[PDB]
Each structure stands twice: as C-alpha cells, then as structure tokens.
C-alpha cells in the first residue's frame, strides 16, 4: 500500500551527487577551475603543487573547456578508474 512518511525511497542517485560538487567548489558557482580547487586542497595536510593540481583537473575534465561542473562530475565520478 501506500505510506505517508516514505522511508523507502533510499536510492543514492544524482541528486545525493549534487552535493559533492558544491563540497569541492568555493562560492558555488556552478564550475570548478586550478585557481578554486587550489584553495580547497590547502585545506589538506599534504602540501600540493600547482602541477598536481593539473592532473585533477585533466582527468576531471570531460568537456575540455578548462573547468568542470555537475555534467563533468556526474561523469567523472560515476567512474574514475
Ligand atoms: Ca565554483
Ligand atoms: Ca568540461
């Protein structure tokens, strides 16, 4: 039958993905570049370099445009390896 609260529906799709991006980003814009992840990565203990950050950004790319965004996350993430 039918059920009032609904705490069936427990299916991590994109939308619990959508999240994960607005982690990674810093104001929230909607895309993701070196100069912005660069930030965020500070935040680590181990100290990155800007050349690092490169390789991020070249497997997180799908679009070749230079950023990513949900597309490119939702795609990046949905399989990386
Ligand atoms: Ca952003
Ligand atoms: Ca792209």
């Not at 529906?9 to 991006?21: C, H, I, P, R």
């Not at 607005?22 to 990565?41: H, S, T, V, W």
């Not at 230079?66 to 949905?78: N, Q």
Request: charged share 45%; glycine share 8%; net charge negative.
């Amino acid at each position: 039958m039918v059920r009032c609260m609904k705490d069936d529906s427990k299916g991590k799709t994109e939308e619990e993905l959508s999240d994960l991006f607005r982690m990674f980003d810093k104001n929230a814009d909607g895309y993701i570049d070196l100069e912005e992840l660069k930030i965020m990565l500070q935040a680590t203990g181990e100290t990155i370099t800007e050349d690092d950050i490169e390789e991020l950004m070249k497997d997180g790319d799908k679009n070749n445009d230079g950023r990513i965004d949900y597309d490119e996350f939702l795609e990046f993430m949905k399989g990386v390896e």
